[PDB]
Design a protein around this ligand. Sequence first.
Ligand SMILES: [Cl-]
Ligand SMILES: [Cl-]
Ligand SMILES: [Cl-]
Ligand SMILES: [Cl-]
Ligand SMILES: [Cl-]
Ligand SMILES: [Cl-]
Ligand code: NA
Ligand code: NA
Ligand SMILES: [Ru+3]
Length: 129
Amino acid sequence: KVFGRCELAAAMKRHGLDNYRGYSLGNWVCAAKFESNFNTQATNRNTDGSTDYGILQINSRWWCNDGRTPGSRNLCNIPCSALLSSDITASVNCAKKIVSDGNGMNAWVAWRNRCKGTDVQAWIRGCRL
Ligand SMILES: [Cl-]
Ligand SMILES: [Cl-]
Ligand SMILES: [Cl-]
Ligand SMILES: [Cl-]
Ligand SMILES: [Cl-]
Ligand SMILES: [Cl-]
Ligand code: NA
Ligand code: NA
Ligand SMILES: [Ru+3]
């Protein structure tokens, strides 16, 4: 599923990301924009052999099991395929664990490079929610 901007904002709010760990809704929408272009089916292989999955590009090195990332962990206790669903529940629940690990949203390189420090409220401007 490719979400619209306001559609994803509303879904993320419903799923409890608004101000989760102190990160306003626009931070999460901005991260999803640049990680996946709002496409739940996005996948990208990393040089080390791990793969990033879903709207928030969650990495099989640590967070999910894909059966092909030797020596990795599965800290969200989910198959990586669950992160590709049209329903964002699995991605949101795993993202909540990631953002709570100590480094906040800096875990998402696209967030650090393209959202951090910017007017992220623009990502939710005009949305009904
Ligand atoms: Cl509720
Ligand atoms: Cl990630
Ligand atoms: Cl594996
Ligand atoms: Cl933080
Ligand atoms: Cl950086
Ligand atoms: Cl800027
Ligand atoms: Na893994
Ligand atoms: Na990134
Ligand atoms: Ru939902």
